[PDB]
Design a protein around this ligand. Structure first.
Ligand SMILES: [Zn+2]
Ligand SMILES: [Zn+2]
Lengths: 100, 100
């Protein structure tokens, strides 16, 4: 049964499992191939990762302007699958699993 | 593909399809056999239907106190399928269909 993902603050649906790619328990994050277009804004600034191998732009929630994850623009070879995809911080989102 | 239903005001998920019973095109409403536990509050007043064949109590969104529908407590025999069941007003809700 699929889950839907929401901003924790305002409760805007950012996207669902189904468009899921991969999770990183190390990073405390998960990555979707797709997101709700109006719910999410990728910011117009490139920031250094902490490591700092990667380059990303923040994605903010459209409703409450929380920084809820990252779009990774440049990556090493091993982090290619999260590149140009929607990476959400677990800390910032909640999941609703459907019934039945 | 399933949908998920939220209050229009606060974005609280009140329930998903799958727990759906029936829809009425005439009155802008639909009916679910289930709702999210603390999502919804059924009020302490018995009100007459518009006809008024039925008796209902209002259901309110827990977070924002919007009247988003009705729990029909008493019905004629043909409207038994919606009795003791969660009837949401379409006007007060919004749907999110899952992708893929
Ligand atoms: Zn938000
Ligand atoms: Zn609400």
């Amino acid at each position: 049964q699929p889950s839907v993902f929401q901003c924790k603050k305002c409760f805007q649906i950012v996207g669902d499992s189904n468009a899921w790619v991969i999770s990183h328990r190390e990073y405390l994050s998960f990555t979707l191939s797709d997101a709700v277009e109006n719910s999410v804004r990728v910011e117009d600034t490139f920031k250094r990762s902490d490591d700092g191998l990667c380059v990303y732009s923040e994605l903010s929630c459209t409703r409450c302007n929380e920084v809820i994850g990252k779009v990774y623009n440049s990556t090493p070879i091993y982090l290619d699958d999260i590149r140009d995809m929607y990476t959400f911080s677990m800390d910032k989102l909640q999941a609703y699993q459907l019934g039945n």
